[PDB]
From a paper:
AaRSs catalyze the attachment of the correct amino acid to its cognate tRNA which then is used in protein synthesis on ribosomes. Phylogenetically phenylalanyl-tRNA synthetase (PheRS), belongs to the class II aaRSs, and it is a dimer of heterodimers (αβ)2, containing two α- (PheS) and two β- (PheT) subunits. Structural studies of PheRS have shown that the α subunit binds L-Phe and ATP and is responsible for esterification catalysis. At the same time, the β subunit is involved in the recognition of the cognate tRNA molecule and editing of mis-charged tRNA.
The protein-fragment interactions were analyzed using crystal structures for five of those fragments complexed with MtPheRS/tRNAPhe (DDD00107555 (D-555), DDD01008876 (D-876), DDD00805735 (D-735), DDD00079004 (D-004) and DDD00067116 (D-116)). The FMO analysis indicates that the sulphonamide group of the D-735 interacts with αArg201 and αGln158 through strong hydrogen bonds. Also, the aniline nitrogen form hydrogen bond with the αGlu217 of D-735 fragment. Synthesis of L-Phe-AMP was inhibited the least by D-735 fragment. In the present study, the 3’ CCA tail of the tRNAPhe in the αβ heterodimer bound to D-735 was translocated into the editing domain, revealing the tRNA conformation during post-transfer editing. In one of the αβ heterodimer of the MtPheRS/tRNAPhe (αβ)2 complex bound to D-735, clear electron density directed towards the β3 and β4 domains of the β subunit was observed. We modeled the 3′ CCA end of the tRNAPhe acceptor stem into this density. An electron density that may be unambiguously attributed to the terminal A76 of the tRNAPhe was present in the deep, narrow tunnel that forms at the interface between the β3 and β4 domains of the β subunit. The D-735 compound occupying the synthetic site is separated by ~36 Å from acceptor end of tRNAPhe within the editing site. Our structural data of one of the αβ heterodimer of MtPheRS/tRNAPhe bound to D-735 provides the experimental validation of the water-mediated hydrolytic mechanism of ester cleavage in the editing site.
Author numbering:
A (entry chain B): 498 to 831
B (entry chain E): -2 to 60, 68 to 84, 88 to 113, 121 to 135, 138 to 831
C (entry chain D): 98 to 271, 276 to 341
D (entry chain A): 98 to 146
The structure:
Amino acid sequence: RGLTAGQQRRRTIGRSLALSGYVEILPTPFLPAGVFDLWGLEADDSRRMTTRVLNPLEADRPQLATTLLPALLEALVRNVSRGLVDVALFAIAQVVQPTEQTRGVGLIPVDRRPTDDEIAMLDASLPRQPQHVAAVLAGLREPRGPWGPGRPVEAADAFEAVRIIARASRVDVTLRPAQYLPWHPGRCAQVFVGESSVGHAGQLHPAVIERSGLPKGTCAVELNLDAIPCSAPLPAPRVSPYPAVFQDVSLVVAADIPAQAVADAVRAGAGDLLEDIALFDVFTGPQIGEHRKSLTFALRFRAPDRTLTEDDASAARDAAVQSAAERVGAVLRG
Amino acid sequence: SNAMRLPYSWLREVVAVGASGWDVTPGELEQTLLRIGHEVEEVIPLGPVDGPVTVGRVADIEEIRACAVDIGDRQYREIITNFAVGDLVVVALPGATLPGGFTISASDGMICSAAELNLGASGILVLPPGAAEPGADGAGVLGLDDVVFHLAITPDRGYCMSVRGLARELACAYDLDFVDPASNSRVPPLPIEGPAWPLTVQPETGVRRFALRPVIGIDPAAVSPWWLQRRLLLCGIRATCPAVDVTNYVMLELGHPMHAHDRNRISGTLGVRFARSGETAVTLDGIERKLDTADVLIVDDAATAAIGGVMGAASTEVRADSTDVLLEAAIWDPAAVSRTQRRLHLPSEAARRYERTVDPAISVAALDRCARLLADIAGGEVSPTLTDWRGDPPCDDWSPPPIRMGVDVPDRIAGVAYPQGTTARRLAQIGAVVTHDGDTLTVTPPSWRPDLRQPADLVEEVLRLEGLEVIPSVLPPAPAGRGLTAGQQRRRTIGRSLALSGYVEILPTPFLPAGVFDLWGLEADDSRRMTTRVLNPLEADRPQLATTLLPALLEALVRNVSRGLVDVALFAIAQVVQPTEQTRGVGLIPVDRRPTDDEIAMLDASLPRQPQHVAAVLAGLREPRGPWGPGRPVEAADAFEAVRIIARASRVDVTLRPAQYLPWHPGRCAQVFVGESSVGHAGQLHPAVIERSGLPKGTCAVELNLDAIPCSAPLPAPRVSPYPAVFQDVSLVVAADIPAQAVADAVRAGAGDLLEDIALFDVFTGPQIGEHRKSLTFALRFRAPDRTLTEDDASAARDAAVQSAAERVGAVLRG
Amino acid sequence: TLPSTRVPAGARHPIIMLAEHVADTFIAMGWELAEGPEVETEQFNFDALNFPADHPARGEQDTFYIAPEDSRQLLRTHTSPVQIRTLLARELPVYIISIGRTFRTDELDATHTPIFHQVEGLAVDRGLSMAHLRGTLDAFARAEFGPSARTRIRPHFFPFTEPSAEVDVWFANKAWVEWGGCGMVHPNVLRATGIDPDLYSGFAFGMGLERTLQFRNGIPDMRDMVEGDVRFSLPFGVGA
Amino acid sequence: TLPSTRVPAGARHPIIMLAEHVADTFIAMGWELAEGPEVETEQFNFDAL
RNA sequence: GGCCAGGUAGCUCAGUCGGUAUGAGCGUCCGCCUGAAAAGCGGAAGGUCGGCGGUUCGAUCCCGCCCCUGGCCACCA
Ligand SMILES: CS(=O)(=O)NCCNc1ccccc1
Ligand SMILES: [Mg+2]
Ligand SMILES: [Mg+2]
Ligand code: NA
């Protein structure tokens, strides 16, 4: 039957991240000594529930990895400490997340096949080992050259790494603000496939960067691939031969309102005529009140069976503005 | 022309002779025909009607007409153009609902036609005198409970172009006893008391049999009975007169097309010969035809009588006053009929059956069937004379050669252990003689099955009658394959890389736009102009095949831009057609053997060069706008980067060099090289080409020849040095024409193995730098594999790079 | 939640992706891929495929012919000549599929296209039966239409096969749908390639990709599948 | 000839690519690819073997 | 193959039997407007009216074949 859907997706994710500038490493399961103390995690953090090795090659590294970031950050330090300060790494491997203390199973006689209940018991006594994809970035994201001085790594680069993985998996994700160490609590997005959390991404916390000897502004992302369902979409696009109508709408919202929520509100009210929407301006000048921001979206309307008029398009735009007013309290720019 | 229509009642009638009481659901018969290999196109029921739809006789017409009609029981109703007084017509009295909701009401009704009655195709329906008493039920007289089957007969089953063939097929599928309607053992055949008409046949013309028998003294006022006219209409043939209706009816019944001539308009001996060049013949339809030297004709001492197996002429055409009829039953060459009927566009009911072969053994039997049927309905006298030309020497056995195959061969091919005797029973069921000799059968197919030539043909007969459903689904043992080739794998990598970089793949059309090279402004001797032409293109202004993929991509680019999508990046991976000579084909190679390698190489050499290219086009914004900024428009360097993307996907190194090559901008065009071989071009298109092609401004394009790029399998073995590096920058001033890569190469040549990396990050012109010169600043990273470097150690390698750049590109250290 | 994609991803064509998925299906069953020229000689396009000399498909109405007239050079009406070349060039046994561009005379509308891509399979070995053909078709149908997919074959006619059959497919995602044609390789084709019909048997099959993608995804207008409009390719994702 | 790669291509790990090539080799011969946990019971790592 | 209806702006379509297609909707451009936009308002650009020819000072509109468009009639031993 060939490759499974999960094995095929694992390749597509690797090809996509590598073509986007990331370098794959082979992460080691043995966590660094006191890595969770540097991260400042609470004593009840689920990542601290680790499986420990009785006879490790280094007595200060007995615990198995519940997350891929400590191994990636270790390879990130190795590259930066040796002259390669503009680096983007990624890894696709499993973690070891025990749900209980180390519980063994007695010897089953090997003169027979183990029963299906005995096979299930051996699996339950093992720690959960889901497959994760993770990545770290530091230094310049885009190098300098005859075009300009390049661009440093920012949190949006880690957010784009999520969407690269999402497109490779052919799933739709949403990013929501969250507080989750070791990330920067003001630059940390929680990734959702539907309403199920699959990981986090963004810039790392500056205190974690200081205590770990990391480069300033280091960003990271870790997703649970087993939590992302394998999708097999069968699109049926219908290309309309009729011209489009281009309009822009400028909305003023509170500063805390996510730009995606404004776009979702605009999309919900515009209806089926809305072919494409794109944010291209965020303005917080003096004519905009404090703790508020102006957002301007480029709208593209097109009917499947007729040529529209500006009044037809403005009806969908005004309906979008009303939806934005009801859902995020937007005010038409004036 | 491939259809075959017949009503179910006629088909059941022939089957019921051997299988009394046979009758199946029309849906069940549809599944049986499908299961044995007959594709049905439509199953059309007749009618339906209800209420007062009766048959009546015209009383008298008062003319647009107005006539009273005896609707039976001495009742008269008046309704208000090819009928006189006394004709039996079908009326739709008030209260009736015709097919399609058409309800008739008060003119005391409506005169019905075969159209709205859902019975045929034309005026009004006229029943022959004596068809039905005025006042009978219209549905029962017209037989609207019948069902017409429309079948698409494959060209290997010409014997199924008749009721005889399909009835035999159903008897095979239902394991029924079959009475062939073309046999002698129903009524004894007609007497043979001498020649019927003198004829001469040129043996080199392909005729296998030519029979004649006259019918003398028929009633010219006689009309075909209703049961014969009705069956003709349901099969798609319109009635005319008894002499013609029987020739078409027998053609449908037995599959042997018949033709009726007027015996009083035949002058002398009939002659079958090839047509002379420029010879004409006024056919039966009154249309003059131009004939070819490869066309068979029937002529006498005066004019031409018929086009062999296609259509008869008007010279001997049966007319309304004909009383002496000479019936023709001939077997023409299928290839000669096919060539003739297609040259002058005459898909005749006789021609379609003749090109699919006709059973030669039934020529006299169908002739006697036709002659006796004509005299019965027209009151004629069947002459006991018969001419039966059967080749020279006269052939008396029309059986194909015997075929030998193992008794279990169908079992092996099907993968099913059929019960014993299955093969011999099925082959005898379809009409073949089967004899045994150990485990080997010797099968002689019947004369109406020329398609049965070798054991494979016999296997199909056994399997299709047993049903393909019984064949199990067994996955074969997989061979130990090698997977994808390097080139096939590489085309996936290129497609994945370009798609992830923002390019959208299209399927390019090989038909170039009209005058695309004139829009590009190419010279007359450009190799891309030497195209391959198509003789029958869907657009006459686009006959040439594609020597380059860009015209197809640019056509899709214009389509996207013209519909609101102005920021487009497209690509395509497909072959081109590049001839090195005029269109030259090789002669026919005998198909009864394997062609030698010299013939195979001769076939490949006669074909134009067809290498696989990869190409791409760009327009509008390369990078879209957003909260990050205003975006970036497409520029020439984006096409150069597309080259680098394809090169990294191919794991080969490329070098770009300035070049002048239309349709590219001469100052913004690069020629791509792998080693020292040219593999394509890339850059921005010429502004004159863009203006003349209706392209967006600044359009860029790439096209590479994948077959010119060699496959590579590098085995890198890098050694990571644990020692620190040394960072230094160098600024070199060169002439403006010196490529930046040539300077970087010269720096890398002098720096030696200490140089770990070099990157250009500044191209500076301006007042400090002289005219037609430029300053380049490279970022250097030195690292030793076994030691830590000092600043002087790196400067020595840097100075060696400066000296290398000085003697290779004339660089001067920036001061 | 701000947009972060500075370089929006593109899209490989759905027909190319479907062709790749079909290829991977047969590679996983030990088969291999072969290519051939789109401008083919009439020898390999009709003559070696047991087409009679007066066949209607040899005419100028149903086949793109290369000018001038009677040049015995044309655009291929199927990918079958690719398998004739493989049969001549490779040693037995042969298990190949060919996925290439095919040229027919049909006008471009909502359900037809003159330029379409089809997949053809060819297996020639010792003791290949119709059961092996049916087994391969069922694995082909399951990989493209789901685990509940199954094929149905009805007798038909093709010049290069004997017995011949048309393949119908059943998929529950929305009844039987006409899919393609198949059959045992005609013995005349084997002798035209130097293969003994008494020692080697074989089967072949052929399905169009545009046809398969149409009723599988419910695409209304097939003109959107060949005209290269970006709005049609992008919804199918990148395809890496 | 100026540099045009604003976003430098990365690299998948060679061991991963070698594994992918080995996997494609056997899959081309009808084989299939299986998976398993790195933390395994002693019953399956030793006793069953 | 004898009669029609049709090919008209970037898209989708109206409309004229001779000097202006005062072409529509949408697409493109400028101004007022906005930090920059869009709408709104006020200005514009762009068609050689399917090709090659034949009549006129003048032809998308008037006779002659073709590119390729869906439809009738006619022909159908
Ligand atoms: C609608 S079709 O063009 O795709 N028909 C496919 C027929 N080709 C074929 C190929 C091998 C064996 C049998 C048939
Ligand atoms: Mg069919
Ligand atoms: Mg047969
Ligand atoms: Na440049």
